[PDB]
Amino acid sequence: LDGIDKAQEEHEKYHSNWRAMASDFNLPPVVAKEIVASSPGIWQLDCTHLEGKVILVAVHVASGYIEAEVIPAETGQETAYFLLKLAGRWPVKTVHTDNGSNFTSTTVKAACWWAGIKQKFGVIESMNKELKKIIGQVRDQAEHLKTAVQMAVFIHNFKRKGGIGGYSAGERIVDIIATDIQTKELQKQITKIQNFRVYYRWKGPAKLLWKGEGAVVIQDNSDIKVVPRRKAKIIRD
Amino acid sequence: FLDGIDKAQEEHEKYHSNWRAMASDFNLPPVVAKEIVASCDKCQLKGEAMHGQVDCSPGIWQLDCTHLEGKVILVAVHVASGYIEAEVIPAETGQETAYFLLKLAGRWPVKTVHTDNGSNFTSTTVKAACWWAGIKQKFAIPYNPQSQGVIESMNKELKKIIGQVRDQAEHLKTAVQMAVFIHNFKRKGGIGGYSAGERIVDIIATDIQTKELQKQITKIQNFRVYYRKGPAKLLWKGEGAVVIQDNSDIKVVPRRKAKII
Amino acid sequence: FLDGIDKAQEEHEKYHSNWRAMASDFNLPPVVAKEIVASCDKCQLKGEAMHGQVDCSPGIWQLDCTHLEGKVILVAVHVASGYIEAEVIPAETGQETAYFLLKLAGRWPVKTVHTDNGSNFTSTTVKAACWWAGIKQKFAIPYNPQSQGVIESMNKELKKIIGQVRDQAEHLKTAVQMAVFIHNFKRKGGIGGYSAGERIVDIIATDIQTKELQKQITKIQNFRVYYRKGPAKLLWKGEGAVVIQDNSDIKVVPRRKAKII
Amino acid sequence: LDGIDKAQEEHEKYHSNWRAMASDFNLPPVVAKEIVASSPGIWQLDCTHLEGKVILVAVHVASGYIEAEVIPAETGQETAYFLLKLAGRWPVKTVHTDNGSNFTSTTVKAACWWAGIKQKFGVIESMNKELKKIIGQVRDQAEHLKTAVQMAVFIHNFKRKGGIGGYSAGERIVDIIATDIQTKELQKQITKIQNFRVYYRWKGPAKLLWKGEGAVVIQDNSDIKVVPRRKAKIIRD
Amino acid sequence: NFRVYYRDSRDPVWKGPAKLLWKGEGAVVIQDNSDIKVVPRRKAKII
Amino acid sequence: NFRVYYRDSRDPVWKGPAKLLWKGEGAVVIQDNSDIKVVPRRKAKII
Amino acid sequence: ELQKQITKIQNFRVYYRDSRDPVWKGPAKLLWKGEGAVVIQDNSDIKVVPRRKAKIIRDYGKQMAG
Amino acid sequence: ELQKQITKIQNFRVYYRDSRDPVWKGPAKLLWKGEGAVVIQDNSDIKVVPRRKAKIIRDYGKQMAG
DNA sequence: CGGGAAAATCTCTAGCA
DNA sequence: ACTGCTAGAGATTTTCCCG
DNA sequence: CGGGAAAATCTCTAGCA
DNA sequence: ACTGCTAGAGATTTTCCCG
Ligand SMILES: C[C@@H]1CCO[C@H]2Cn3cc(C(=O)NCc4ccc(F)cc4F)c(=O)c(O)c3C(=O)N12
Ligand SMILES: C[C@@H]1CCO[C@H]2Cn3cc(C(=O)NCc4ccc(F)cc4F)c(=O)c(O)c3C(=O)N12
Ligand SMILES: [Mg+2]
Ligand SMILES: [Mg+2]
Ligand SMILES: [Mg+2]
Ligand SMILES: [Mg+2]
Ligand SMILES: [Zn+2]
Ligand SMILES: [Zn+2]
């Protein structure tokens, strides 16, 4: 409540996003969003071949997290089934395919329509190369190919660590989805309050931002003012 | 009471009367009637009236099989979150179950699986899988489905959903995935008003973040506490209370009679 | 909300999401999400979380059959008291059951029997017996054993005793009578610390005595009460409260605004 | 507590039992028992014959309440079974038999020993005559004899009312057993307290009688004195 | 008026909507397609 | 020392007395004639 | 006469239940008894109870311990 | 430095149970987390809880509402 | 008025199949 | 228009007994 | 500080077979 | 040495909103 001006100065000086502001100055995130205003569901789907069997790989673009299963036939049914599975395990909003015959079937289209996925026809190929490398590294430890494929998916998602932080793809996908959940929660709050108008001290209508226990933060004429709760009236428009 | 006790043992030996009846009829102290009933082997016919509580650590999964329309459905649940992975399988075999489990362990952090003693879960090939993935295997007490109450209730729930959406698929495997999707992302409640997918994300992310933060705090905040003893390692000071860990034993002591060095 | 509602009905039609999920994702008032779920026929899959309560009038008996070691045991319980009459029978037939019931009605006051819908209890000959003895027949809701929870728990208890005393008889009918004896007279507890035999004596004697006493009081204490109405018949005055019966309707009114004539 | 002297006078004047005293003067029954001090479990067992079948009748002597069942053979097994049944339905302390062959069997003796009944080898015959009368009255309403026997047992125990009060045998047996339960309860209380000695005001040991909420009734030198609780000490001897 | 959804008799499949004809403590009487039933309230939902 | 009476595994017959070897929250480990078992505390009585 | 009768009628204990509570409420005093209803008094509170819900005893172990 | 870290660690909510109570106790504040035990604070009461009994979230919907 | 121990009450489970 | 219950085991709270 | 309504919490059940 | 649980329905209590 007091750090609002400090936050405004910091943002004018460094162009900092709402997270770093609501973290360093202890502000409710709707207020930091107002100041700063004053991918996660994207997967790539491609089929690869290896020892005469079809491996249907899905990569989470933001993290490099891999879901691959050996399928029986490069048909539309096996791909629609793989896609329902993926959409039930992770939040999937958009798949990037390559206009192959199976990816364009009416079956996959009905699957995407049921699971609310959007279809859009380079990381996938490098990931196929890494997957094939690990599969060749662990082929002598399984009889069948599907087993070695899952061993490789495991090694890639959890036993290979890279990037800046030194994390693995599972850690990365969990961090990314967590941040994404936060984004939807914040947007839901903003959408919940953005239909209220506040009259304070009476002055003109103000965009409401927060409704704490001891104050009511608002925004009037592109400027943020804190008022005590009893000094203002909140109505829904 | 020596007379009234012997007339009571002789009558219990015939009728196995409860302690109230032998207190009312032989004029006995309730403790003595209870000692009589408590020495009859034939009267020990009842167990405690409690329940245990299942482990709910972040890395424990409960697996079970369930049957529907003649097919076998293997199901896993993340205990802490309620997040499920199901899959229709060809047959309740150890091979298929070991496959399902390798997939799960590659898609999520699985530290421990808990199952009943079905032959597929106890097979030597599910054990080789768990050994490769570094999973700990916990087997229930036999014929105690309450040891797996989470997965067993999830069977209820999965079956309930599959019946709501059965007319939208043709095959059962499709409807099983539809139900896994609906449960993991389209049903909200429990701790945090979440869905199970959001909740597993929160649980796993919280585990990573808290591990990191506490690692840093302990690297920095390095002190020894003497209370009332040895140099107990400090854990948390605040609000006039001190929590320490003396010889791998965690206890809460007030700030008085506790010096920090 | 007109936009958010239609996006919610379209999504429920596919996933049958619960009201919390449609409130969180389409920004809806919980009452509106609940109205959406409440109009989906496919989502009505659960009943209330209560239980009814069985009738426990002094003259109601619950009868059931139970099976042990290949024989049929007919059992009756007096609901108010817990007092049992059991008997091994040749076969679960209406003839045998009508016989058992004539015996019971001649040994005790039986006004009403309550049974499930087993074929022996619903036979036309058990009905002729009940009509001769002036018994009212009450049949449960089919496949609802909870309607007979008293007799069903008595099966538990009878079977439990028969197992304690089975090694003292040779035949099963002997052990059944031994168990009826032990239950009716050698087990104490419940209301009044009684045994079931003492308790049935107390219940029946109390019923007779209270009937007589109240008959006398009403013959003597004859008054009409006007409160707030008509000449309501007085029931009980005392402690500043008046209980009356206006047109077969019993109500408690304070002494104020109530004159006795 | 105050009516103790009135009770003593009434008992010296009319020799009234402890019930009428503890009812008219509002006294705890142990006290009325002390003042007045200063069958229920008896059954008759006999077999009768009728249409070539054996009917085994039991009569409660005090009330005239009847238990009769047609039995298959006048053997010791059927009589031991009838006796276990009766002892499990009613409190049976002593049976009066007639030294017949079945009543003297080792089987009936073992039954009586298990059920704690005492065996002792005119009302039974008059009751057999009344039972036969009712059976002849209701024979046309049943096919078998056992059914008519139970119809007659019913009519006798509940539809025939006689005696002083105008009650039936079922009402009578319930009243008698109720009074008997009261007798055992009182005797149990007397046996529970008769091992205590009270010292009041200190005076010699006194037989304790009651331990109410506001007093302690005792009996010393064949005389009953009420003392307040704090003025006396209760010990167990 | 009320809509009733019920589980009847060993059939684990919920049915309805039926008309509620009578509600007691413990059980309800409904009309499902001219077929009057009696259902325990543990096995019904009234809306 | 304790005496344990227990219902083991689908057998509806209570057995014992066994020695208690270990008691946890939820279950106990007993020794019945050199045969170590693990029983849920819902299915045991310790004396 | 009548007051004796009433004091007698109020010596019977009543155990009873409310329509959604499974536990039996402890002994109350009986004030009136009809065909359908029993009027009791539990802790200076005059409830009406349907007959099917009331267990009316006398408790003989109590009549005799005072 | 360190006090930032501690204030962060105390923003995670904990749901937990006692060894004989089946219901999950509402959100407490996390003070310390070890391998076996979690130290919480529920209504100014510093309990120790075994890990197997604690569900440590962060509630994102609450965090983003203040 | 204070503790200690025992009585009384309360809470909760399996089995009824 | 009908309806879960009962008894034992352990935990927890009340009552009573002597100070 | 007072009610009213809505949110939040609590209580309790079936099914898991 | 391991362990009933989950989600919905209705009832009941809290909280919040404007006075
Ligand atoms: C041959 C494997 C190994 C050995 O035992 C059998 C038999 N069994 C029986 C049930 C069962 O009785 N469910 C009803 C239930 C009752 C109470 C409760 F708390 C939870 C509940 F689920 C199962 O669920 C189950 O998976 C098995 C099983 O797998 N097996
Ligand atoms: C053919 C007759 C007529 C129609 O129905 C069947 C089947 N049935 C089933 C049970 C039973 O499932 N008992 C377990 C139980 C479960 C819950 C509960 F609250 C009480 C309980 F006793 C009985 O007891 C019983 O007598 C019968 C029976 O007689 N019949
Ligand atoms: Mg299983
Ligand atoms: Mg199972
Ligand atoms: Mg039956
Ligand atoms: Mg039954
Ligand atoms: Zn015994
Ligand atoms: Zn629906």
Residues D73 and D54 sit within 8 Å (Cβ to Cβ): yes
Q: Which of D83, B5, D73, D120 has the alpha carbon at shortest distance from C178?
A: D83
CA–CA separation, H1 and B217 (whole Å): 9
Cα atoms found within 13 Å of the Cα of residue A206, Cβ hemisphere only: 25
Instruction: Tokens for B191, please give them.
Output: 């701790």
d(CA F5, CA F31): 11
What is the distance between the alpha carbons of residues F19 and B149, in angstroms, rounded to a whole number? 29
Tell me if H55 sits within 8 A of H15, measured CB to CB. yes
Q: In what order do the strands lie in the sheet with A65-71?
A: A65-71, A53-60, A42-50, A94-96, A118-120
CB H54 within 8 A of CB H42: no
Q: Alpha carbon of C44 to those of A92, B227, C39, E19, E23: distances in Å? A: 29, 60, 9, 15, 19
CB of B140 sitting under 6 A from ligand 1: no
- Distance, C-alpha D29 to centroid of its chain: 18
Cβ-contact D138, C93 below 8 angstroms: no
Q: Answer whether residue H15 is part of any domain.
A: yes
Q: Which of H52, H64, H60 is nearest to H18 (CA)?
A: H52
- Going across the sheet that includes D223-227, the strands are D223-227, D216-220, D206-208, D196-200, D232-236
Q: Which residues pair with D1 in a beta bridge?
A: none
Q: Which residues contact B43 (CB under 8 A, 6 or more apart)?
A: B16, B37, C164
> Which residue has the least CA–C1' distance to nucleotide L1?
F29
DSSP string, B203-222: HHHHHHHHHHHHHHHHHH--
Q: Which two tokens stand for residue E25?
A: 């403590």
Packing angle between helix D76-89 and helix D106-114, nearest 10 degrees?
Answer: 20
Which residues sit directly before a break in chain D (C to N > 2.5 Å)?
38, 121, 201
Q: Which of D29, D31, D35 has the alpha carbon at shortest distance from D10? A: D35
Q: Of G41, G40, G38, G42, which is closest to residue G50 (Cα–Cα)?
A: G38
**Where does D51-168 show beta strands of DSSP type E?**
53-60, 65-71, 94-96, 118-120, 161-162, 167-168
Strand pairing category for C224-227 and C83-89? unpaired
Q: Which two tokens stand for residue F40?
A: 């849920």
Query: How many angstroms separate the Cα of C175 from the Cα of each of B19, C158, C169, D72?
Result: 22, 10, 6, 20
Q: How far, in Å, CA of B229 to CA of G62, rounded?
A: 59
Question: Other C-beta atoms within 10 Å of H22: how many?
Answer: 9
D58 DSSP β-pair partners: D45, D67
- The H or E element spanning position A119 is strand A118-120
* D131-to-D123, D125, D147, H51 alpha-carbon distances in Å: 12, 10, 13, 77
Residue G17, in any domain of the structure: yes
User: What's the one-letter identity of residue B80?
Assistant: A
Kind plus residue range of the DSSP H or E element containing B104 = helix B94-107
DSSP single-letter state for residue C59: T
Cα pseudo-dihedral F27, F33, F36, F38, rounded to 10: -20
Rounded Cα–Cα distance for residues C253 and G39 (Å)? 13
Q: Using DSSP, state whether A134 is helix, strand or coil.
A: helix
DSSP A68-82: EEEESSSSHHHHHHH
Evaluate whether residue H62 is within a structural domain. no
Question: Peptide bond before E17: cis, by omega within 30 degrees of 0?
Answer: yes
Q: How far apart, in whole angstroms, are the C-alpha atoms of residue C245 and residue C247? A: 6
Which domain covers residue F7, as residue numbers? Answer: 1-47
Instruction: Find out whether the beta carbon of C74 lies less than 6 Å from any atom of ligand 2.
Output: no
Instruction: Decide: D28 and D217 in contact? Cβ < 8 Å.
Output: yes
Helix (H) or strand (E) holding A183: helix A169-193
Name the strand (E) or helix (H) holding A47: strand A42-50
Quote the tokens at residue B244: 């320490």
Q: Mark the nucleotides of strand L covered by protein, meaning any atom under 7 Å from a CB.
A: 1-10, 17-18
Q: Is the peptide bond before B29 cis (omega within 30 degrees of 0)?
A: no
| Residue C3 to residues A183, C25, C26, C247, G49, Cα–Cα distance (Å) | 22, 12, 9, 56, 53
CB atoms within 10 A of CB B238: 13
Q: Which of B226, B227, B254 is nearest to B240 (CA)?
A: B254
DSSP assignment of H8-53 equals HHTTSEEEE--TT--SPEEEEEEEEE-SSEEEEESSS---EEEGGG
Say if CB D92 and CB D115 are below 8 A apart. Answer: yes
Query: Is D98 annotated as belonging to a binding site?
Result: yes
**Tokens at B130, concatenated:** 């768990």
Look up the protein residue whose alpha carbon has the minimum distance to the C1' of J10: B48
CB–CB contact A178 B205 (8 Å): yes
- D49 annotated ligand-binding residue: no
Of residues D44, D43, D45, the one with CA closest to residue D102: D45
Are chains E and A in touch, 3+ Cβ pairs below 8 Å?
no
8-state DSSP, B188: B
Smallest CA-to-CA distance from C57 within C114, C127, C121 is with C114
Cα A3 to Cα C141: distance, rounded to the nearest angstrom: 68
The response to whether residue C159 sits with its C-beta less than 6 Å from ligand 2 reads no
Nearest CA in chain B to H47: B252
| Chain G nearest CA to D221, separation (Å) | 24
| Widest distance between CA atoms in chain D | 79
**Calpha distance A222→A31 (Å, rounded):** 13
Please give the number of the atom of ligand 1 that sits closest to the Cα of B65. Answer: 26
| The token pair that represents C149 in the structure block | 């929870």
Number of domains in chain E: 1
Contacts of A231 (CB under 8 A, 6+ apart): A200, A201
DSSP H/E element including B253: strand B250-254
- CB within 8 Å of F37: residues ≥ 6 apart: F6, F8, F18, F29, F30, F31
Assigned token pair, A230:
């009893």
B196-220 vs A169-193: helix crossing angle, rounded to 10? 110
Q: Which protein residue's CA is at the shortest distance from atom 22 of ligand 2?
A: C152
Read off the DSSP letter of residue A92: -
For chain G, where are the E strands, in sequence order?
Answer: 13-16, 25-33, 37-41, 48-50, 54-56
Q: How far apart are CA D101 and CA B46, in angstroms?
A: 45
- Note which residues in 30-69 of chain B have CB less than 8 A from chain H: 50-51, 53, 55-58
Residue positions counted in chain H = 66
What count of residues does chain A have? 237
Question: How crowded is the C-beta side of G34, counted as CA atoms within 13 Å?
Answer: 18
Determine whether F31 is exposed, middle or buried from the number of CB atoms within 10 Å of its CB (0-12, 13-18, 19+). middle
- With beta carbons less than 8 A apart as the criterion, state whether B116 and B63 touch: no
> Rounded to the nearest 5 degrees, what angle is found at the Cα of B190, between the Cα atoms of B187 and B194?
55
Q: Which of B116, B121, B126 to mutate to test the pocket of ligand 1 (most atoms within 8 A of CB)?
A: B116
| Interatomic separation, CA of residue C27 and C1' of nucleotide L8, rounded (Å) | 21
Residue B143: helix, strand or coil by DSSP? coil
Sheet holding F27-31, edge to edge: F36-40, F27-31, F15-23, F3-6, F44-46
For testing the chain C interface, which of D113, D174, D177 should be mutated: the one with the most C CBs within 10 Å?
Answer: D174
Helix B196-220 and helix B172-185, axial crossing angle in degrees, nearest 10:
50
Q: Which residue matches tokens 């409401």?
A: A208
Amino acid (1-letter code) at residue D157: N
Within 10 angstroms of residue B72's Cβ, the number of other Cβ atoms is 18
Q: How many residues does chain E have?
A: 47
Please give the residue of chain C at the shortest CA–CA distance from B179: C15
Tokens of B125: 């090939």
Q: Using the structure block, give the residue that is written with the tokens 């929160």.
A: B202
- List CB contacts (< 8 A) between D175 and chain C: 205, 208
Q: Cα A38 to chain center, whole Å?
A: 24
* Token pair of G4 as six digits: 């004796």
Q: For residue A41, what are its two tokens?
A: 């569901």
Two tokens, residue C180: 């009826």
Does C152 show up as a binding residue in the annotation?
Answer: yes
Distance D26 CA to J19 C1' (A): 34
C-alpha separations of B113 from B98, B130, F42, G18, G24 in Å: 12, 9, 23, 46, 44
**Residue A159: Cβ within 10 Å count:** 12
Rounded to whole angstroms, the Cα distance separating G64 from G59 reads 9
d(CA D35, CA D8): 7
SS (H, E, C) C146-186: HHHHHHHHHHHHHHHHHHHCHHHCCCHHHHHHHHHHHHHHC
Read off the tokens for C69.
């070691």
Flag if C189 and B18 touch (Cβ within 8 Å): yes
Q: How far apart are CA F9 and CA B141, in angstroms?
A: 9
The torsion angles phi and psi of A124, rounded to 5 degrees, stand at: -60, -35
Tell me how far apart the alpha carbons of residues G18 and G49 are, in angstroms, rounded to a whole number.
8
Q: Residue B115's beta-bridge partner residues?
A: B139
What is the crossing angle of helices C172-185 and C196-220, to 10°? Answer: 50
Report which protein residue has its CA nearest ligand 1's atom 24: B145
Q: Tell me the CB-side half-sphere exposure of residue A188, using CA atoms within 13 A.
A: 21
Residue H39 to residues C208, F24, H32, Cα–Cα distance (Å): 64, 22, 5
**How many domains, chain H?**
1
**E32 interaction partners in chain C (CB closer than 8 Å):** none
DSSP state string for D149-190: HHHHHHIIIII-EETTTTEEHHHHHHHHHHHHHHHHHHHHHH
Which experimental method was this entry solved with? cryo-EM
> In whole angstroms, what is the distance from residue D134 CA to residue C106 CA?
13
How many residues are present in chain B? Answer: 261
Q: How many CA atoms lie within 13 A of D122 on its CB side?
A: 0
Number of neighbouring beta carbons within 10 Å of residue D218: 27
CA torsion, points B101, B106, B110, B113, in degrees to nearest 10?
A: 0
Whether the CB of C14 is below 8 Å from some CB of chain A: the reply is: yes
Spatial distance from the CA of C242 to the C1' of I11 (Å): 38
Q: How far apart are the CA of H35 and the nearest CA of chain B, in angstroms?
A: 10
What is the identity of the amino acid at D234?
Answer: I
| Beta carbons within 8 Å of A64's beta carbon, 6+ residues apart | A123, A127, A169, A172
H helices present in B108-195, as ranges: 124-132, 149-164, 172-185
The residues pairing with B138 across neighbouring beta strands, listed in sequence order, are B114
Buried b (16+ CB within 10 A) or exposed e, C30-42: eebbbebbeeeee
CB distance A4 to A27 below 8 Å: yes
Q: Which tokens is E18 given?
A: 């039926």
- The footprint of strand I (CB < 7 Å) covers B 29-31, 47, 49-51, 146; C 64, 66-67, 145, 149, 152-153, 155-156, 159; F 7, 12, 42; G 23, 26; H 22
> Contact at 8 Å (CB) between C192 and C199?
yes
Asked if residues A145 and A54 have their Cβ atoms less than 8 Å apart, the reply is: no
Containing H/E element for D4? helix D4-14
